[PDB]
Design a protein around this nucleic acid. Structure first.
Ligand SMILES: [Zn+2]
Ligand SMILES: [Zn+2]
Ligand SMILES: [Zn+2]
Lengths: 186, 596, 72, 187
RNA sequence: UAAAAU
RNA sequence: AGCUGCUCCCUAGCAUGCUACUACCG
RNA sequence: GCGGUAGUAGCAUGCUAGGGAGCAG
């Protein structure tokens, strides 16, 4: 602290005492330098002790409003930060088994149930367009989740069976397309 | 208490309180807005006043930050800072602020009066943020102006619902329509409690006005009816989402063999799905609306929602939907208001119906696959933001024609609004080009399409459906019995009086007039169920009866003439004051005693 | 490398739970068991199998807009 | 701080002192009217600092009796609530069956565990798997607690209805497995 | 001075 | 949504204690 | 020059009250 008003008065008082102690004058006129200088150390230290408390209420309001703002913005964005965190960590993981199903899933090829692990349960995945059908179904083997599944039943949106030999480039425009391929793991 | 600046989207906590909508502004932007405008009030975490008891100085540019509060210079503490200093104002996040130099247009929007064409002309050529700002502030200005109207009280009781009122003298009386409502309060000595809302109707003679009460409180002599105002909610989503293209059809799976009646629309049905949003502009009464349900069944599994700003429009297209689609169809229009009621189909509370029909202000917040907003020539940027906020879908499709009717925009009283500036999507359709074009009449007589295409459009219409029966006797219209600013002329009705029964088979025509009160005069001495030219626009009938007024700038509007004549099947008539429109008119001239 | 997949499985189950997946007891039991079994794994090749099985649950329903969060 | 008997005394003392300082005649003036801020501030210490504690203690007494009033209202609210519960709970039991079993007690008191056994009018079974459903509530009427109960409404963990046709053995692996069969007492 | 909102 | 035990941090009040300097008396 | 009370400012301790967080059975 410094530039406070009463600091001027206290500074002039102690400068007057500097002058008196350099001159070495009278001691009874020195009763003006401890009956009017000690009046300064209390005309000031009661105005320096009223910005020391304001300067503390400022801090304990600042440090509280800050966290009251954040601690509330944090809770108003969980359903959208959790997802970005999830996919950041997934991309960083780097595993082709997951990258395959994620990419596939981008281009509307999702599964319809939990991918099973047994060497014999079923998997039913959707296939929306032909250019998808080519890259994955070569004959009767299905390449999903970095494995090989033997295709057993294709069935279009008609909910009626489609023959596997009927699916090709030319005759494609006729099938209700989003299909549901069913298969079993190798 | 924190947000984003309206111009540069930086962090801030300042609002220019003198502006009606109280928009967030950053430091530099608030300084620029307040150094050049009569707006000099600011509000941060707490209002910026001189916090000395008895002082009321509020101009920010002269206030000073003291101890835990802001102080006048007279009431300044020994230690303090000036708030407005060095081209900025003091708020949160001061040194991380970005200053956009759109303060010119911002001040234009902030201090304008929406009275001359320049205000709307600049409302729809700014950035999207300023676009939404101008939209909500304009609606706010209009509905707060509505407060300056007059008030009415009782005069004497005459029945149970037709009585005599007293408008307060000296201030404008509001128009008399069933959407201008006043809440009624009785003030006995003592006793000033609500008694209900009311909507009125001027009946058969003066000064009597039949009325409709929200509850059967027996009216006495000491009550009054004061107009109840409304509030405005701020917007969030933009007018139109940015476009994305694709290389293959996404989300939608076509068909091959259903109802080729929609034949020429297939290549266009694909182009709809291979984009993010597209527009279809169409001359009056063509493949529009047809196209909507055509694409609807072309993509059978596709969730689709339909919308329009005018009730009669969504209802007429719900009818045209009923004509073709599985039912399996609902029109979630309105639970129990808009007292001119509508459909008779299903539900307003389920939102699993594959086909939902409603009006913009009453949309529920649903997911969809296609949103077919209809007649964009009648909507404003406000409404477009409303739809883009409530719904999200995969594709968007807008259908309309800017050459027809715009939004009324009551307060504008000098200049003209070209369709380019009706809203955002009309601009888009006329600046680069409707990205989808269809133009030849299916509906109304070939000759009248020749008439309309001869005048509003350069001639580019053809169709079928020929004669007969069209007439324009240039009919003198007598006394403009003008109670409200909506015109009334019954000597003109002397022609349906000249043709009451001599039309022995012309029994189900449709009567439309530019003026609402003279149309209630069609509801005064009755000939047939009548409509307005605004409750038309997306509605078609067989034979049409029409009455005008004097050559006011109102009825003389070529666009309302367009949307009045182009809504028939094979017959119409035009009874016009007519200085040169019967020199526009391509029909057979008749006279008043010419009944054969 | 296994700590990576364990923390990732924590984040995944939390997302699934935020998407109201515990409204169907069968699905929630399946995911809960896959999660607790991943956390107790002790060789990083079983953990990845159960992680692909667990992520299939999220890839099934259409509530998370995958093409957007995959802006890379 | 303002209108007290000491402020005016200090005011007149320092007014006389103003007169005496404008004079500045003798040192006796200085002494006798420096005994005027030396005598008039003790009263400005007492009757201007004492009542700075009067308001303190009055306001804390006020807040304490505020909180006591609120804590005496919440007591009334909770006792009303629990009285309502007690009186709405007995409006479900006063069967003549309960009186029938109490009047046969050779004393008037009976174990608690048997009251819902012999007087309740609704049973709820929670069944883990199909093999247990087979042995317990099989059909549409079964017998338990020496009475004959009849099934109506069957639900599952998700609490959605189920018809007894779905509860077969090959369709068993397709239901939320703890089923909750609710039956009534049929005579 | 035209449409018309849990 | 439990019963305990220990530890750190922040705030408030009171009295006590301590010390400096100012006013009244002895 | 010192004893007594009455003050302000500063300091330490201790104790009550209030809130936040961590570990253990
Ligand atoms: Zn302003
Ligand atoms: Zn800014
Ligand atoms: Zn002031």
């Amino acid at each position: 602290f410094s530039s406070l008003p009463s600091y001027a008065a206290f500074a002039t008082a102690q400068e007057a005492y500097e002058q008196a102690v350099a001159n070495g004058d009278s001691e009874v006129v020195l009763k003006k330098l401890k009956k009017s200088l000690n009046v300064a150390k209390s005309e000031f230290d009661r105005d320096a002790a009223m910005q020391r408390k304001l300067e503390k209420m400022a801090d304990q309001a600042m440090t509280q409003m800050y966290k009251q703002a954040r601690s509330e913005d944090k809770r108003a964005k969980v359903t959208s930060a959790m997802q970005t965190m999830l996919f950041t960590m997934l991309r960083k993981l780097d595993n082709d088994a997951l990258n395959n199903i994620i990419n596939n899933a981008r281009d509307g090829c999702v599964p319809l149930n939990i991918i099973p692990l047994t060497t014999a349960a079923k998997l039913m995945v959707v296939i929306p367009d032909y250019n998808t059908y080519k890259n994955t179904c070569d004959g009767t083997t299905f390449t999903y989740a970095s494995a090989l599944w033997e295709i057993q039943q294709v069935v279009d949106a008609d909910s009626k069976i489609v023959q596997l030999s009927e699916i090709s480039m030319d005759n494609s425009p006729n099938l209700a397309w989003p299909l549901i391929v069913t298969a079993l793991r190798a | 208490a924190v947000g984003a600046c309206v111009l540069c989207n930086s962090q801030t906590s300042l609002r220019c309180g003198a502006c009606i909508r109280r928009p967030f502004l950053c430091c530099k932007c608030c300084y620029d807005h307040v150094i050049s405008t009569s707006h000099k009030l600011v509000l941060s975490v707490n209002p910026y006043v001189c916090n000395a008891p008895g002082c009321d100085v509020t101009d920010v540019t002269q206030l000073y930050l003291g101890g835990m509060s802001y102080y006048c210079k007279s009431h300044k503490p020994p230690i303090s800072f000036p708030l407005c200093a060095n081209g900025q104002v003091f708020g949160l996040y001061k040194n991380t602020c970005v200053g956009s130099d759109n303060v010119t247009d911002f001040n234009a929007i902030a201090t304008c009066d929406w009275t001359n064409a320049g205000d709307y002309i600049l409302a729809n050529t700014c950035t999207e943020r300023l676009k939404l700002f101008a939209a909500e502030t304009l609606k706010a200005t209009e509905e707060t102006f509505k407060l300056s109207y007059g008030i009415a009280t009782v005069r004497e009781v005459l029945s149970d619902r037709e009585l005599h009122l007293s408008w307060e003298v000296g201030k404008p009386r509001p128009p008399l329509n069933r959407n201008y409502v006043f809440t009624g309060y009785r003030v006995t000595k003592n006793s000033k409690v609500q008694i209900g809302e009311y909507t009125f109707e001027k009946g058969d003679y003066g000064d009597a006005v039949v009325y409709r009460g929200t509850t059967t409180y027996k009216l006495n002599v000491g009550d009054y009816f004061v107009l109840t105002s409304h509030t405005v909610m701020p917007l969030s989503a933009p007018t139109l989402v940015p476009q994305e293209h694709y290389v293959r059809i996404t989300g939608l799976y076509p068909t091959l063999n259903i109802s080729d009646e929609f034949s020429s629309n297939v290549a266009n049905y694909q182009k709809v799905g291979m984009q993010k949003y597209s527009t279809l502009q169409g001359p009056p009464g063509t493949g529009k609306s047809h196209f909507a349900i055509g694409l609807a069944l072309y993509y059978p599994s596709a969730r689709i929602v339909y919308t329009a700003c005018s009730h009669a429009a969504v209802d007429a297209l719900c009818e045209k939907a009923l004509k073709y689609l599985p039912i399996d169809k609902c029109s979630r229009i309105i639970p129990a208001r808009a007292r001119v009621e509508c459909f008779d189909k299903f539900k307003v509370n389920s939102t699993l119906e594959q086909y939902v029909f409603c009006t913009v202000n009453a949309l529920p917040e649903t997911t969809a696959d296609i949103v077919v907003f209809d007649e964009i020539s009648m909507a404003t940027n406000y409404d477009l933001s409303v739809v883009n906020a409530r719904l999200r879908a995969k594709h968007y499709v807008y259908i309309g024609d800017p050459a027809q009717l715009p939004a009324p925009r009551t307060l504008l009283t000098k200049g003209t609004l070209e369709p380019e500036y009706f809203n955002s999507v009309c601009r888009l359709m006329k600046t680069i080009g409707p990205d989808m074009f269809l133009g030849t009449c299916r509906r109304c007589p070939a000759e009248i399409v020749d008439t309309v295409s001869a005048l509003v459009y350069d001639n580019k219409l053809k169709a079928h459906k020929d004669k007969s029966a069209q007439c324009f006797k240039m009919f003198y219209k007598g006394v403009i019995t003008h109670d409200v600013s909506s015109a009334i002329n019954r000597p003109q009705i002397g022609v349906v009086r000249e043709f009451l029964t001599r039309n022995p088979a012309w029994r189900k025509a449709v009567f439309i007039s530019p003026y609402n009160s003279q149309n209630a005069v069609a509801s005064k001495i009755l000939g047939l169920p009548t409509q307005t030219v605004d409750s038309s626009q997306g509605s078609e009938y067989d034979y049409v009866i029409f009455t005008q007024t004097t050559e006011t700038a109102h009825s003389c509007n070529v666009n309302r003439f367009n949307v009045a004549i182009t809504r028939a099947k094979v017959g119409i008539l035009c009874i016009m004051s007519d200085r040169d429109l019967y020199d526009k008119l391509q029909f057979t001239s008749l006279e008043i005693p010419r009944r054969n | 490398k296994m700590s990576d997949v364990k923390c990732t499985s924590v984040v995944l189950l939390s997302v699934l739970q935020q998407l109201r997946v515990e409204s169907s007891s069968k699905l929630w039991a399946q995911c809960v068991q896959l999660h607790n079994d991943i956390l107790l794994a002790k060789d990083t090749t079983e953990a990845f199998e159960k992680m692909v099985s667990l992520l299939s649950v999220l890839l099934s329903m259409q509530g998370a807009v995958d093409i957007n969060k995959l802006c890379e």
